[PDB]
């Protein structure tokens, strides 16, 4: 029996929900239960993105599945440039400041080729042109070598239909598009599978077909990217068991528990609750809020999405010259990172050897940089971007700050505690007050009370002995979220969730 954690894809930078899925995969491995991640959306660079975190046997992508490319690895690179000039007798004309060539047959222009790397090892795409220099077709290559998809274009490079190939060049799916409000949308999908021909109207019905082909009696599904996965599971038979996993607050306005509408990303799930064996959330409080709101229609259980190991990298090797504060969060509005820049403005006149390092990425990074310049804090606040390994950055961190107005758990909060970095956080739904005990491993602060924020952060700067004590409380609290603690809950859950 296999457990399937269904999300949508994997980007370059690991996000929360994706890390929750990988954490869970590692916990099932440690306890010996088979588990694989399931990705839905077409992504010809997915084998690259996943290489950093899981193996190729640890995941199934839907498009790979119907393209007969599941568990396939990279080929040894093909020298396209050499095949084009020596074997096809084409002429290449490099496009300056690019990895691109224009390709001609004896002064006739045929193709525009874009490679990914500057070594020309990874063909990315190839555009085809007709006798009038219309772009009639675009060939998109998988990072593993093969040509994944060809897109047919009409009028002003609008998408009309897409063909998806197995690594041998056989067609395996066809998608047909019509434009609605200026974007292309799928109106028909044809799949060639098991020697038959199947017809669908949209990607959700294709998804539901995929779940059905994956399923074998005794398997269990976990719905983690519910804006896509709940509609898919709504089209599958109730005989296929699926657990819904919430990763955020569940309603649009958390201060109206009884009345607020569910977030858009969960609507489809909450409107078909009886399809699901259970709902999992990360925190106690959200379990109780959700079970009330749904009038106990199905079980609601809490299993944190994050866990700690012990750290072999250095812990609390602090510079005695400056104070290092850190923020580990997306550059995104609900994290309210502008408030931490204000905090530093106020503190810099009192403790001038201070530094705030902000790790993440996102749309707010321009407003935050402008805010730092407005205040002349370029010497003190550092937008550090996204680092895939933070271990060394926690080594010399005095304090972690959270000014978010909305969390599901906060993996960064537990990760900070596990490196012995105490945390000061607004007391918001959901996570911080289950993870922080005031005066033990940090302080909780009334939401958006920026004065109390300044007071308590100043207090810890003034009292390095307190910071030492809260540090050790952090290693202790982190132990309550150990790998073993989480395995014990997942094992009991999986043993009880199926019907009998």
């Amino acid at each position: 029996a296999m457990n399937y954690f269904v999300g949508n894809s994997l980007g370059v930078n690991l996000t929360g929900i994706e890390k929750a899925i990988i954490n869970r995969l590692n916990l099932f491995k440690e306890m010996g239960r088979p588990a694989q991640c399931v990705f839905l959306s077409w992504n010809r660079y997915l084998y690259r993105n996943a290489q950093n975190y899981i193996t190729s046997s640890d995941y199934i992508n839907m498009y790979d599945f119907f393209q007969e490319a599941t568990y396939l690895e990279r080929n040894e690179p093909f020298d396209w440039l050499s095949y084009w000039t020596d074997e096809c007798h084409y002429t290449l004309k490099h496009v300056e400041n690019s990895h691109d060539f224009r390709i001609y047959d004896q002064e006739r222009f045929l193709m525009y080729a874009h490679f990914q790397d500057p070594k020309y090892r990874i063909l990315d795409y190839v555009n085809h042109f007709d006798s009038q220099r219309r772009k009639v077709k675009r060939d998109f290559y998988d990072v593993r070598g093969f040509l994944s998809c060809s897109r047919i274009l009409v009028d002003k490079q609008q998408t009309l239909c897409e063909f998806f190939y197995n690594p041998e060049g056989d067609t395996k799916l066809e998608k047909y598009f019509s434009y609605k409000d200026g974007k292309p949308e799928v109106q028909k999908i044809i799949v060639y599978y098991a020697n038959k021909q199947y017809f669908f109207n949209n990607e959700t019905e294709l998804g539901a077909f995929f779940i059905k082909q994956l399923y074998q009696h005794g398997d269990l599904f976990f719905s983690d990217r519910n804006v896509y996965t709940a509609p898919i599971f709504n089209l599958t038979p109730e005989s296929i068991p699926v657990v819904a996993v919430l990763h955020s607050t569940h309603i649009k306005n958390i201060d109206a528990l009884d009345s607020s509408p569910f977030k858009n990303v969960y609507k489809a799930m909450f409107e078909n609750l009886s399809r699901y064996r259970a709902i999992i959330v990360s925190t106690e409080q959200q379990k109780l809020d959700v079970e009330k709101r749904i009038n106990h229609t199905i079980p609601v259980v809490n299993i944190p999405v994050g866990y700690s190991e012990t750290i072999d990298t250095p812990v609390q090797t602090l510079d005695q010259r400056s104070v290092k504060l850190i923020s580990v969060a997306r550059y995104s509005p609900e994290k309210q990172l502008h408030q931490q820049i204000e905090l530093i403005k106020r503190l810099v006149s009192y403790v001038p050897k201070i530094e705030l390092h902000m790790y993440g990425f996102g749309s707010e990074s321009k407003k935050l940089n402008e805010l730092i310049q407005k205040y002349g804090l370029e010497n003190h606040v550092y937008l550090r971007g996204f680092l895939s390994n933070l271990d060394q950055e926690y080594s010399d961190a005095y304090l972690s700050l959270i000014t978010s107005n909305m969390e599901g758990f906060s993996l960064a909060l537990l990760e900070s505690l596990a490196h012995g970095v105490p945390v000061i956080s607004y007391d918001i739904k959901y996570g911080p007050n289950e993870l922080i005990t005031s005066d033990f491993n940090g302080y909780l602060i009334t939401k958006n009370d920026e004065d109390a924020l300044f007071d308590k952060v100043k207090y810890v700067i003034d009292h390095p002995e307190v910071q030492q004590r809260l540090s050790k409380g952090s290693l202790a609290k982190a132990q309550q979220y150990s790998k073993a603690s989480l395995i014990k809950q997942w094992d009991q859950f999986v043993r009880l969730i199926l019907e009998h």
Partner: peptide, 8 residues
Amino acid sequence: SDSDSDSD
């Protein structure tokens, strides 16, 4: 230039 429509 018109030649820039060849890419993307």
